[model samples]
Target: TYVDPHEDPTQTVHEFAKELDATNISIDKVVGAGEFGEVCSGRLKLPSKKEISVAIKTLKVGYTEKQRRDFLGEASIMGQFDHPNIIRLEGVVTKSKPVMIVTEYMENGSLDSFLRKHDAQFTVIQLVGMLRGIASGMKYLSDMGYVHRDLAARNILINSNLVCKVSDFGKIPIRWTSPEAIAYRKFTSASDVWSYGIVLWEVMSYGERPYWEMSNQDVIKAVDEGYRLPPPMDCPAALYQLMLDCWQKDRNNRPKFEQIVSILDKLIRNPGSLKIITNLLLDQS
Candidate 1:
C-alpha cells in the first residue's frame, strides 16, 4: 500500500524523510537540550566504512502524541531543504524507539555564541561574508515558499571554515520580529527580513544584546513609534542603511531575500564602499 505523504501529515515523517538505522548511530555526548529532548554530538557509521560527525536530537521517552508530532515536524521541514547555507539533515530514526533527527555537525556551533567568543576578531568584510551566506539561504527558502518565522544570529550555525548556515528554525522575540508580526501575528518572509536586520546588528556588534536593556514591550512600543536601532559601534554605513531598509514598517517596502543577497554581493565586491559612515546628524535635519 502506497500512501502519499502530502495526503497525511503523519505520513510525511516516514515517507518524505529518509529513515536511518539506529544500530549505525553512536551518541557521543550530550551537547545541549532541545525543546523536546536531548541534543547530542554523535557519529553515523555506514556499511561502506564511512563515518561522519552528526548532531542528533533524541525525542524524550513517554512523550505525548503532540510532542512526537511536533518533534518530527521539525525533521520533516529540515529534510526538504538542500542548500549550502542551510543546515543539512542527514536523516531521521522513526522506526525505532527514542526517535531521533540527525543533522550535520557544525564545528563552530551557533553563530551567536561563536561571535561572542571571538568578539571584534572579524573585519567588516568578513562579517559581510557571513551575512551574504545567511541572505543566500533565506533567498532559497523564500523561493521554496518557506518562511523562516525565526531568523536570528543564534539560529545560524558556523562550520570549521567559518561558513555560516541558517538553522532551526524560536520564541517570538519582539526585538527581532517585525511590527505586523508582533501586532497582527502575520508572519511572512518580510518579517524574516525584519529579523535579519537585527541579525546584521548582532554580527556587527559581535553578539551584543539587541536593544540593550529595553524590555520586549518597550521595544515593541518604540518600533511602533518609528524608532529604529542605531548602528553598532564601527558598523559600516552602507550596512546600516541595509539594516534600516530591512526595518521598514511596511512589510511591502522591505527588500526581498533575493534583493538582500544581491545587495550584499554588491557590498562584497566593493569593500571600500563600507568605509563611508553616513552622518547620523544629517538625517535628522
Candidate 2:
C-alpha cells in the first residue's frame, strides 16, 4: 500500500500544513526513491525571490483514494512532528497537478549509504551519537503514538551537520509484514522497538545486512529461537546491550522510547562504557 497524494486527515486533526505555490518549486535531480515515489532534489523559491534547497516527493497523478489517504497520511504524520531529528514537512502541492510533498533536503542522504561508504569514519561516541539522534526522533514518534514500523538505517537521513532525521513513514518492507512481525505488534510501540533493534545491527555492522544473505524466513525463525545476531565488529558492548533490549523476544519487555532516550543519555554521559566489545551471550549470563 504505497502512497501518492491526497487529502489526509491530519490537515484537520492538527491542521498541520501550509499552502505552497507550485510555481515556486523547480525539481533538479533525483536524490532517492521510496514508497512515495522518486525523491528529487529541488529549489523552493520564495516570494522574496531567494531559494532554498528542498526535496520533493511526488506520487503519480492517477492515485486512488487509498493511495492518497496513506501517502498524504504520511505527510500528516510528519507534518506535526517538529523534532530536529525527524524530517521536516515543508508543504504539500495537492491543489496543483503532479502532487508533491516538499521537505527539507539532507545533503548527506541516508545513514545506510554514508555508513557503507565510510564505515571507519565513526568513533564509538560518533556511532552512539547517531544512534542517540535516531532514538530521539523515535521518542517523539512514540510519544505521539505513531509506530514507525519501517524504521531502519535506510529510512534515517543524515544532514550536513551529521544529524540523523527519521523519514519514510509509509514504507513498510513486505516480508516484515508477516504474522510474526504483526503479532509482535500486539503492543504498537513494541513493534517499532523491534525494528529499531535491526537498525542497531545495521549501525554497528556499518550498514551490512542484518542476517547477510539469509532469507527473511530464516532470520525470523532464528530470532524466535533466541538466536540474536552477534555484536557487530568492534561494536561497544553497552550499545549492543541496548540493541538486545530492543530485540527482546517478549514484546512487552521492550523498553519505551523514553527509556531508550534515558539509556542513551546515560551512555552519552559515560562514553567510556562503550569502548569494550560486548558479547551478548556472555553478558546474558
Candidate 3:
C-alpha cells in the first residue's frame, strides 16, 4: 500500500523495530528518522486489507517509565483532536518496549522542506495559500480549546494536494475550564494566537530557520529586549505589525486565534489596499 518515491527506500530505513506485541498492525518500511524517533510508512493488515499508510513515531529506549507516560499523555491528547488541519492519530501501541504512536503520513513532508525547494518560484498567491492553510489549522485547534505551543514551520506538513496539516502535537497545551484551579495545567487561547503569528513569519520568510545566526539564549534575550526579525521582501507592513503585537511580552495583549484568522484573511485578500502608515516613518529616514 505504499508508493515508492524514486529514491532508494533502504537509505531511509530506520533501525528501530515495530512494537510487535501491542497490536496486529504490520509495519513494512521506515520512511524517516529523527533524534527522538522515526516514522515508519506502513499499512494495517485488517479484515478487508484496508490500504492505509501510517507514520509510526517511536520514543527512544532509555526513556524512564515516567517519560514514557508523559509521551503517551501527549499522544493521548493528539488522539482526541479530530480536525482537517490537525494530523489524525490512528492508534497507539504502548505494551511494547519502545512505544509507538501511529498517524497519517503526509507524502509532501514538512513545510520547511517544501518551501526551501519551491520558494524561488513561489508567487504571492501561493504564499498566501500556505498562510491560509496554517491559519485554518490554528483556527481548528483554537475552536477545540487546544493551543499548539510550538507552531513552527517544521511542525506543518503538506499533503500531495498542497493541503497543510499541523502535526507534532507533543507540545500542545490543553485549556483548563477554570483559572481558580491551582494546577498550572492549561494553555490560554491567546498563547496559541501568539504562536500563529510566528508561523506567519515562517511563511513570509520562506521557511528560514528561526533566530537565524542567533543562539537560543540570544533569541530569548532578543524577545525580552523587544527585538523581532525584520520583514522579508514583499511581506506587507501591516502584517508584520500584527506579528509584533502577538509577540508582546504580556500574553493578555495577544489576540484570539479566531481574531488572528480573521485579520489574516482580510490582509491577504486586499493586501495592497491595507495602507500601512508605519512604513511612512521608515521611508522618511
Candidate 4:
C-alpha cells in the first residue's frame, strides 16, 4: 500500500527530493555499476535551458517496490544538504520508467580510486587540502545533526578541481567503524570521528587498505586491545596525532567536527608545521 506523504511521521521524502521530469535528462555513457544499477555520466537540461553534466544512478528494471523506495530514500538524504564539500543532488525521477537519481558529476570519481591512481604524485599540501575538504563537509553534517554511518576514503568523491566531497552516507564497515559502535551498536559524531581517523590514514597513504588483509574479527579484537592504525608514510606527526585523537576509545574523548576543521585550517595556514615528522624535532633539541 502506498503510504500518503501527508501521513509521514517525519517530513516527507517528496518535500526534500525534487521530482524531476525524466525527459529532461539524457544519458551520455555508463561510468560504473552500483547496487542500484548503471551509474552514468549524463546531461540534465535545466528549466532555464542550460545544460550541465550530471552523474545519474538508474534503478535496474524488475526492481521490487521496496528497492525503488530504498533507492529514492538516498536522494532524499542527499537533497536536504548544501555544502561545497558535500555531493550536490540535482533531483530524482520517479514519474517514468527507469527511475534515476541525479547528482553533480565528479570528474575524478571516488577519492580512494583517484588517490590509488595518482599515488605519490600529490604534494603533501594538496593531500592536506583534500583532507580539509572532507573534514569541512563532515563538519557541516555534524553541525546539521547528521551522523555518517560510513565515513571513508572510498565514499568521498573528487571533482576536476581536486575538491573532495562526502558521498555514500551509509556504512558499518568493521575496520572503518569505531570500536564503541561495533560493540554497542551506538553511532554518533564521535563514532564518525573514529572512522574519519581511518580515512586520514587512507588519504595519507594514497588509499592503502586499513589493517591490510586482516579479518574484520581480528580488526575488532585489535581495536578493543587498544591498537590504533599507525601513521602513513611521510605523514606529519601533528596530523597523525589528530588521527589518534579521533580514534580515542571513549567517544566523549574524540574531538568534535568543528575542532577538526579548525585544526586543519591552522595546518593549512602554517605549512611548516606539517614538515615535522616527529613530535620532538631534532632541530629543537
TM, every model: 0.92, 0.85, 0.72, 0.92
Per-residue lDDT of model 3, residues 206-240, tens digit only = 88765676655555455545566667666767778
lDDT of 3 at 254: 71
Which of the two, 2 or 4, has more lDDT?
4
Misplaced by over 4 Å in model 2 are: 1-14, 46-50, 61-66, 171-187, 279-285
- Say which prediction, candidate 1 or candidate 2, comes out ahead on lDDT: 1
Q: Kindly list the per-residue Cα lDDT of model 1 for residues 6-120, writing each as its tens digit.
A: 3464647765577899988999999888889999998998678799999999999999988987888887777778899999988999888898999999988999999999988
Model 1 off-target regions past 4 Å?
Answer: 1-9, 46-48, 278-285
lDDT of each: 0.85, 0.77, 0.64, 0.85
Model 2, residue pairs in steric clash: 237-278
Q: Lowest lDDT 10-mer window, candidate 4?
A: 276-285
The 10-residue segment of model 3 with minimum total lDDT is 173-182
In terms of lDDT, the poorest run of 10 residues in model 1 is: 276-285
- Clashes in candidate 4: how many? 0
> Against the true structure, what is every candidate's RMSD?
3.4, 4.1, 10.1, 4.8
Roughly what TM-score does model 2 have, to 2 decimal places?
0.85
